[PDB]
Amino acid sequence: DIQMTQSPSSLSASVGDTVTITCQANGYLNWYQQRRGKAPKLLIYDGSKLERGVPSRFSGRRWGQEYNLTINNLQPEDIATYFCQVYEFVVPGTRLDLKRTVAAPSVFIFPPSDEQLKSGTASVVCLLNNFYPREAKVQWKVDNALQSGNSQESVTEQDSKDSTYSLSSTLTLSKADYEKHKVYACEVTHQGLSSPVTKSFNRG
Amino acid sequence: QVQLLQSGAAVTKPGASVRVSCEASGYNIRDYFIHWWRQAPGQGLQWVGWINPKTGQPNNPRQFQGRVSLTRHASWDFDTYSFYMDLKALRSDDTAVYFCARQRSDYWDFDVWGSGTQVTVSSASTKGPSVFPLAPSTAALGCLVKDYFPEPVTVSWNSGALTSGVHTFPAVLQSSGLYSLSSVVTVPSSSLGTQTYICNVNHKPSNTKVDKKVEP
Amino acid sequence: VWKDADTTLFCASDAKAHETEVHNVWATHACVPTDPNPQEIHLENVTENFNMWKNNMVEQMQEDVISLWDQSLQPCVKLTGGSVIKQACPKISFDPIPIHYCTPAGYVILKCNDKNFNGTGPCKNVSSVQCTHGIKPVVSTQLLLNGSLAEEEIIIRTENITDNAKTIIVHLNKSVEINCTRPSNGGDIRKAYCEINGTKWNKVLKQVTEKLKEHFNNKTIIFQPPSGGDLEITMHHFNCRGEFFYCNTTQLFNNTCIKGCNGTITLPCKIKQIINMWQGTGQAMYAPPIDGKINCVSNITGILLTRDGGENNSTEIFRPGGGNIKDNWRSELYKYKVVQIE
Ligand SMILES: *[C@@H]1O[C@H](CO)[C@@H](O)[C@H](O)[C@H]1NC(C)=O
Ligand SMILES: *[C@@H]1O[C@H](CO)[C@@H](O)[C@H](O)[C@H]1NC(C)=O
Ligand SMILES: *[C@@H]1O[C@H](CO)[C@@H](O)[C@H](O)[C@H]1NC(C)=O
Ligand SMILES: *[C@@H]1O[C@H](CO)[C@@H](O)[C@H](O)[C@H]1NC(C)=O
Ligand SMILES: *[C@@H]1O[C@H](CO)[C@@H](O)[C@H](O)[C@H]1NC(C)=O
Ligand SMILES: *[C@@H]1O[C@H](CO)[C@@H](O)[C@H](O)[C@H]1NC(C)=O
Ligand SMILES: *[C@@H]1O[C@H](CO)[C@@H](O)[C@H](O)[C@H]1NC(C)=O
Ligand SMILES: *[C@@H]1O[C@H](CO)[C@@H](O)[C@H](O)[C@H]1NC(C)=O
Ligand SMILES: *[C@@H]1O[C@H](CO)[C@@H](O)[C@H](O)[C@H]1NC(C)=O
Ligand SMILES: *[C@@H]1O[C@H](CO)[C@@H](O)[C@H](O)[C@H]1NC(C)=O
Ligand SMILES: *[C@@H]1O[C@H](CO)[C@@H](O)[C@H](O)[C@H]1NC(C)=O
Numbered sequence: 001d002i003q004m005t006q007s008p009s010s011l012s013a014s015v016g017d018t019v020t021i022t023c024q025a026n027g028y029l030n031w032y033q034q035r036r037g038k039a040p041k042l043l044i045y046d047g048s049k050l051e052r053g054v055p056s057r058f059s060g061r062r063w064g065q066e067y068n069l070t071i072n073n074l075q076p077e078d079i080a081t082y083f084c085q086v087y088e089f090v091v092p093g094t095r096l097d098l099k100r101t102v103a104a105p106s107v108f109i110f111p112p113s114d115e116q117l118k119s120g121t122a123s124v125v126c127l128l129n130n131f132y133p134r135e136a137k138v139q140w141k142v143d144n145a146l147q148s149g150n151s152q153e154s155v156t157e158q159d160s161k162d163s164t165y166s167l168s169s170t171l172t173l174s175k176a177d178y179e180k181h182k183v184y185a186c187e188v189t190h191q192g193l194s195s196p197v198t199k200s201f202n203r204g
Numbered sequence: 205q206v207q208l209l210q211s212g213a214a215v216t217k218p219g220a221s222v223r224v225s226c227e228a229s230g231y232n233i234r235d236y237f238i239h240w241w242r243q244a245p246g247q248g249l250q251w252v253g254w255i256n257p258k259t260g261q262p263n264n265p266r267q268f269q270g271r272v273s274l275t276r277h278a279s280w281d282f283d284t285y286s287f288y289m290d291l292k293a294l295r296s297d298d299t300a301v302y303f304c305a306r307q308r309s310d311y312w313d314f315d316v317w318g319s320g321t322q323v324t325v326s327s328a329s330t331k332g333p334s335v336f337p338l339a340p341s342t343a344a345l346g347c348l349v350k351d352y353f354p355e356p357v358t359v360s361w362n363s364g365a366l367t368s369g370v371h372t373f374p375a376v377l378q379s380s381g382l383y384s385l386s387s388v389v390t391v392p393s394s395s396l397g398t399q400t401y402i403c404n405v406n407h408k409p410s411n412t413k414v415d416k417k418v419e420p
Numbered sequence: 421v422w423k424d425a426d427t428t429l430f431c432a433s434d435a436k437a438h439e440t441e442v443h444n445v446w447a448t449h450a451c452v453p454t455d456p457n458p459q460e461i462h463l464e465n466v467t468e469n470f471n472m473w474k475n476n477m478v479e480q481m482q483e484d485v486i487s488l489w490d491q492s493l494q495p496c497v498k499l500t501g502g503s504v505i506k507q508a509c510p511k512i513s514f515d516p517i518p519i520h521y522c523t524p525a526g527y528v529i530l531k532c533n534d535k536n537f538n539g540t541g542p543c544k545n546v547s548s549v550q551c552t553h554g555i556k557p558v559v560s561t562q563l564l565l566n567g568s569l570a571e572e573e574i575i576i577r578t579e580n581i582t583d584n585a586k587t588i589i590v591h592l593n594k595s596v597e598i599n600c601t602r603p604s605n606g607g608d609i610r611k612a613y614c615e616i617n618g619t620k621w622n623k624v625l626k627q628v629t630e631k632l633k634e635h636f637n638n639k640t641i642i643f644q645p646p647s648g649g650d651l652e653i654t655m656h657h658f659n660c661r662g663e664f665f666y667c668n669t670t671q672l673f674n675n676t677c678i679k680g681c682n683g684t685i686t687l688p689c690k691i692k693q694i695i696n697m698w699q700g701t702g703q704a705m706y707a708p709p710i711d712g713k714i715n716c717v718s719n720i721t722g723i724l725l726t727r728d729g730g731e732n733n734s735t736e737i738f739r740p741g742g743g744n745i746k747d748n749w750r751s752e753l754y755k756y757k758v759v760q761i762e
Contacts, residue, residue, distance in 0.1 A: 001582070001636075001637060002582060027582060028310070028311040028312060028313075030311065030312070030313050030314075032314075038320075039303060039317035039318065039319060039320055040249075040303075040314070040317055041317075042313060042314060042315045045308075045309065045311045045313035045315075046309075046311050046313070051315065083248065083249075085249075085312070085314075086312075087312050087582070087583065087584070087729075088251035088265070088312075088584070088729050088730055089251070089731075090248055090249045090250070090251070091248060092247070092248035093248060106342075106344070106390070108343075108344045110338045110339070110346075111339070112336075113336040113337050113338070113339070113348070115336055115337070116334075116336045116348075116350075119334070121350075123336075123348060123350065125338060125348065125386060127344060127346075127388060129344060129371070129388075129390065130369075152376050152378070154373040154374055154375075154376050154385065154386070155373070155374075156371055156372075156373055156374070166371040166373070168371075168373045168386050168388070170376075170384075170386070172378075234700065237585060251729065251730060253729070254585060254729075256649070256743065258700060258743060258744075259649045259650050259652070259653050259742075259743035260648060260649035260650045260653075261646075261647070261648065261649035261650075261653055261726070261741065261743065262647045262648045262649065263584060263585070263647065263726065263728065263729050264647065264728070264729075264730070265728065265729055265730020265731065265732070266728070266730055266731070266732055266737075267730075269647075269728070273648065274648065275648075280499075280501055280502035281501045281502060282501075282702075307585070310580070310583065310585075310586075312583075312585075
């Protein structure tokens with residue numbers, strides 16, 4: 001009958017900063033850090049007790065029903081997801097990222113390869129490159145028609161140095177339908193861009 | 205030195221069975237409970253159960269009850285143990301990274317974790333990927349790695365000579381059942397015409413190796 | 421004024437020096453005779469905290485029995501790391517006797533008299549004694565035999581109930597006989613059976629579910645078989661007359677009976693020569709069972725349970741448990757505590 005919640009679940013802060021996250025549970029709470037593709041690392045047990053071989057930046061307040069987790073002097077290694085745990089119960093967590101590298105995406109567009117068209121499949125790829133923040137909007141226009149439902153996009157993790165993202169949207173359709181229209185557009189919407197940047201190409 | 209080592213990746217059809225192993229060593233093992241956890245893609249952790257090494261007693265929640273079987277056996281000197289998890293009647297949404305960890309205290313704190321074991325559940329037989337080039341036009345280019353099962357592939361450039369500004373996107377799961385990703389790279393405009401650009405793609409599960417040359 | 425303190429106890433019994441029974445022989449050389457008239461003094465307006473789960477009295481009784489078994493029933497074969505030990509393993513007389521634990525000069529035992537004390541917390545009605553009551557060092561799993569009864573009502577003991585890794589001890593306030601025999605002419609000579617009055621059992625069983633509802637927000641209470649593990653815990657493991665019994669208690673936890681649920685319940689049992697030693701030191705091997713009728717009549721006085729973890733919300737699930745024999749000793753010493761006179 002043990003219940004627990006999370007705090008903002010996603011926040012961003014600059015290098016060498018102080019960040020806090022809160023859970024509200026009624027039992028022995030622990031804190032973990034997990035980097036993408038790897039196993040969790042214990043940081044704090046019983047709310048306040050710091051695990052050994054772990055930077056003194058980290059700490060936890062054990063007052064009332066809420067549990068704080070604080071991080072001082074934010075290092076580049078500290079960028080990962082964090083979450084709390086009470087007995088067998090665990091919360092999804094909270095992603096982390098830094099700030100103020102406000103950059104426009106380098107938007108490119110790719111036609112399908114000739115080798116691909118032989119197998120009767122056409123994949124059009126639009127690429128966004130190195131930007132911040134991660135919030136963008138991509139829509140496919142085919143002969144000036146909004147394309148919805150037939151698109152799959154993918155996002156990279158925040159790059160270690162330039163602190164930027166990258167998004168790749170792939171429009172996928174039959175060879176017959178590709179050879180049916182001429183102009184394929186990949187319009188881009190970003191808060192950074194003064195105007196939406198549109199890239200296109202004529203088939204041929 | 206403590207140590208928890210988990211077995212290699214697994215791939216199976218639904219309704220089948222799978223066994224993942226966890227071998228513990230450098231500590232007094234009878235004195236600590238071992239828990240199993242799993243993590244579905246993009247999701248949080250999820251408790252699978254615990255097993256008492258002294259008695260072999262298992263404890264599993266409602267959902268994995270019926271399926272799942274936690275087991276253990278020890279070496280002669282009781283210096284090394286092996287902990288198995290047998291998940292039965294696999295369902296597609298059982299695809300997750302399976303972890304094993306040590307419960308140190310009554311705080312249920314987990315200080316030592318296994319590396320994790322990848323377990324993939326679906327139809328879709330083993331298939332190599334098709335690698336199509338992405339022609340350039342500063343400018344950008346790359347490779348398209350379409351239709352392969354299962355994950356993962358490892359993409360480099362010029363046998364690992366070009367690592368600058370490389371963006372290898374995480375694969376996506378196409379509605380067919382096959383995965384597909386994209387690898388790209390950025391170079392100055394004067395690069396085209398003299399330099400040789402090659403993407404190195406490896407898909408171990410299908411033993412498929414491909415080196416493709418990208419060019420306008 | 422005193423303080424909670426640890427120290428080496430000593431033991432008292434009524435071991436007969438002529439008896440060849442193994443508990444009798446041991447206590448003859450390890451224990452003093454019992455005091456005819458022990459004194460108990462009830463302390464006025466005093467409150468002491470107890471914690472049956474952190475009581476060093478247990479560790480010592482544990483060392484005692486391990487030593488008792490190691491001298492008395494040695495197997496024909498046992499393992500030692502990577503080597504096989506062979507020794508003579510003759511038959512013995514086996515019937516455990518009550519052992520009192522006693523403090524040395526400068527210490528006393530404090531005792532809790534609150535009738536509904538769960539083992540962990542403040543106790544208002546406190547007294548003081550020189551020795552515990554007589555405790556039979558009975559080793560078994562799932563069920564607790566030949567112990568003491570709660571002074572009404574029924575009591576649930578844990579340490580932390582919200583922790584599923586923590587064993588739950590149910591302490592009965594009325595007992596239920598259990599009647600086990602390997603029949604006369606032996607025809608599987610290892611085939612035995614246990615008999616319990618179903619009418620009596622199912623009433624007690626229902627009452628336990630009522631008390632469990634108190635600690636678990638009126639949720640439905642369901643019993644289930646052991647989920648797995650060594651045979652010593654999936655079965656109801658115990659020693660009778662020197663022989664190693666294992667009994668199936670599926671029929672002992674029948675949720676439907678909580679139609680024809682009033683009849684005598686018969687549990688199928690077996691005597692095993694090859695076992696896993698409760699001392700925790702791997703497999704041993706004993707000789708085939710003795711000839712004739714082999715009968716054990718015991719009182720069930722307590723149950724050990726384990727609750728299924730995870731999000732259930734609707735229901736709670738309880739399976740029988742054991743393995744840790746220190747928990748058998750905790751069930752009797754829960755009310756005792758050693759202090760040093762400052
Ligand atoms: C048991 O553990 C809980 C959860 O950590 C704790 O809050 C509580 O104080 C403990 N209760 C008992 C019965 O000791
Ligand atoms: C962190 O936790 C404490 C303790 O509950 C809380 O009072 C405080 O508001 C939190 N700190 C911040 C920066 O909000
Ligand atoms: C305390 O417990 C004893 C049981 O041994 C009982 O006889 C006595 O009346 C109790 N004392 C008081 C005043 O509660
Ligand atoms: C036992 O009683 C104490 C005092 O009320 C209490 O703190 C503890 O939680 C109880 N244990 C249980 C609930 O079995
Ligand atoms: C069985 O329990 C009864 C009380 O119900 C008791 O009189 C008797 O001593 C017990 N038999 C044993 C422990 O052998
Ligand atoms: C045992 O305790 C229960 C409540 O837990 C009560 O209903 C019952 O009367 C008690 N049994 C006896 C024999 O007094
Ligand atoms: C125990 O069971 C045996 C065999 O069924 C029977 O002969 C004996 O009378 C029973 N003993 C008691 C006291 O219930
Ligand atoms: C069986 O148990 C019931 C419930 O108390 C009791 O009334 C009955 O007399 C017992 N049956 C016997 C001893 O024949
Ligand atoms: C006990 O008996 C039940 C019912 O006959 C059977 O399903 C189960 O396998 C047995 N359990 C053990 C541990 O032998
Ligand atoms: C419970 O007992 C009844 C009465 O004998 C029996 O018919 C039924 O099979 C039992 N319930 C189980 C084991 O599912
Ligand atoms: C319980 O006590 C009786 C004698 O009163 C004895 O026959 C029986 O063996 C004891 N139980 C066990 C399993 O030791």
